[PDB]
From a paper:
The carboxy-terminal part comprises an intrinsically disordered low-complexity domain (LCD), which contains regions enriched in glycine, hydrophobic residues, and glutamine and asparagine (Q/N). The abnormal assembly of [name] ([name]) in neuronal and glial cells characterizes nearly all cases of amyotrophic lateral sclerosis (ALS) and around half of cases of frontotemporal lobar degeneration ([name]).
Fewer than 5% of the filament segments contributed to classes with these alternative conformations, demonstrating that they were rare. No variation was observed at regions of zipper packing between β-strands. Our mass spectrometry analysis also revealed that R293 was monomethylated in some [name] molecules. Methyl-R293 is incompatible with the main conformation of the filament fold, owing to steric clashes, and can only be accommodated in the alternative conformation of the N-terminal region, where its side chain is exposed. Mapping of the filament segment locations in the micrographs revealed that [name] molecules with different local structural variations could coexist in individual filaments.
Numbering used by the authors:
A (entry chain A), B (entry chain B), C (entry chain U), D (entry chain C), E (entry chain D): 281 to 360
Write the structure that this text describes.
Amino acid sequence: GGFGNQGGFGNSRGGGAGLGNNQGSNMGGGMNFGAFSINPAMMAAAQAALQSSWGMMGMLASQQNQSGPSGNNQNQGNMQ
Amino acid sequence: GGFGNQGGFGNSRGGGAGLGNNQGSNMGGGMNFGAFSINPAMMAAAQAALQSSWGMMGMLASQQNQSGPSGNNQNQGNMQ
Amino acid sequence: GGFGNQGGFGNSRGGGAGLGNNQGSNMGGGMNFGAFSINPAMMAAAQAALQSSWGMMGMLASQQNQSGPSGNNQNQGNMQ
Amino acid sequence: GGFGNQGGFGNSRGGGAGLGNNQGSNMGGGMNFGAFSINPAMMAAAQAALQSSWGMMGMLASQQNQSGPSGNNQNQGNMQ
Amino acid sequence: GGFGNQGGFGNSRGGGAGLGNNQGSNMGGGMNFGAFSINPAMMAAAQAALQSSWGMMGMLASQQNQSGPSGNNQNQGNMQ
């Protein structure tokens, strides 16, 4: 019942793996995630823009504006 | 019943693997995810734009504008 | 009953694998996912634009505009 | 009953594998997914544009515009 | 009964494999999926545009415009 509720996860002998119950939100743009593993190796590189939105009885006569990244330089070295 | 509710995951002896129950949201644009594994190896590279939206009794006479990434330079090294 | 509800996943001795119950949302544009595995190896490269939308009694006299990524340079190294 | 509801998956001794119950949403544009496997090997490369939409008693006198990626350069190395 | 409902999958001793119940949505444009397998090997390459739409008592005096990817360069290396 009600409005906009979200239940719990991983309880009462929890188990499994994943991503769940996201409303109006953003996940990424250069990110690594590792749990319960042996000798993981991960590389990520991103040039990105992300925009998101959720509205109930709302988001009315409104506005959301974004200009992306422009004109940058970046250097990351080695890992031996 | 009600409006916009989301149930829980991985409970009461949870198990399995995945992605579930996303409303108006974004997942990606350069990302790695690894759990419960042996010797994983992962590479990701992205040049991207993502835009998303969910509205009930809402999102009315509104606006959502995005200009993507322009004119960048990026270098990532080796992993030995 | 009600409006826009989503049930839970992986409960009460959960099992299986996949992607389910997505409304107005985006998944991809350079992404790897690996669980419960032995010696996985994954490579991904993307140049992309994604745009998405869900509306009930809504999304009315509205607008959604996107310009993609333009004019970038990117280099990712080796993994030995 | 009601409007726009989605039932749960993988419960009460769950099993199987796949993709289900997607409304107005996008999945792909450079992506790998691997669960419960031995020695998987995966390669993906994409140059893409994806656009999607779902509307009930809605999506009225509205607009959705996309310009794709233009003029980029990208290099990803080896995995030995 | 009602409008636009979708039932659950993989429950109560679930089994099988596939893709089901998609409304107005897109799946592909460079993507691999592998579960419950031994020594899988997969390669995918795409240059693509996808556009999709579902409307009930809706999608009225509206518009949906897409320009595809133009003028890009991309190189992905070996996997030994």
